[PDB]
């Protein structure tokens, strides 16, 4: 679908058998989700943002279904104020910017 930006570009995703709303974020290199229950091994990692850095858990090869499109990639889980779908997954669902 085509999405205008008068409102936050939120979509529904299913990951780890759970449903969540996430922001389609072209400015983010990575995908980071709020604290949630995911299975498997993970490594410690630090990512930066507008106000500094936060520590998160890195899960690789995680399956995510974004607005009906499946994608597998790295997902970070930590103290983010909102669920963000970054470019590593946006490219997989064929998301583009147009103007």
Ligand X SMILES: CC(C)[C@H](NC(=O)N(C)Cc1ccccn1)C(=O)N[C@@H](Cc1ccccc1)[C@H](O)[C@@H](O)[C@H](CC1CCCCC1)NC(=O)[C@@H](NC(=O)N(C)Cc1ccccn1)C(C)C
Q: How far apart are CA 88 and CA 52, in angstroms?
A: 21
Please choose, out of 4-12, 13-21, 35-43, 57-65, the segment that lies near its own copies by the rule CB under 8 A.
4-12
Q: Are 22 and 10 in contact (CB under 8 A)?
A: yes
Our CB check for ligand X shows the closer of 17 and 48 to be 48
| 70 near its own copies (CB under 8 A) | no
Q: Is 25 a catalytic residue?
A: yes
Torsion, Cα 46 71 18 30, to 10 degrees, reads 20
* Residues lying near its own copies in the complex (CB under 8 A): 1-6, 8-9, 23-29, 32, 47-54, 67, 69, 80-81, 84, 87, 90-91, 93-99
């Amino acid at each position: 679908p085509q999405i205008t930006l008068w409102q936050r570009p939120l979509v529904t995703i299913k990951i780890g058998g759970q449903l969540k709303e996430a922001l389609l974020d072209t400015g983010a290199d990575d995908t980071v989700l709020e604290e949630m229950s995911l299975p498997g091994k993970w490594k410690p990692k630090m990512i930066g943002g507008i106000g500094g850095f936060i520590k998160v858990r890195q899960y690789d090869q995680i399956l995510i279904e974004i607005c009906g499109h499946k994608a597998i990639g790295t997902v970070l889980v930590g103290p983010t104020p909102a669920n963000i779908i970054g470019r590593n997954l946006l490219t997989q669902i064929g998301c583009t910017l147009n103007f």
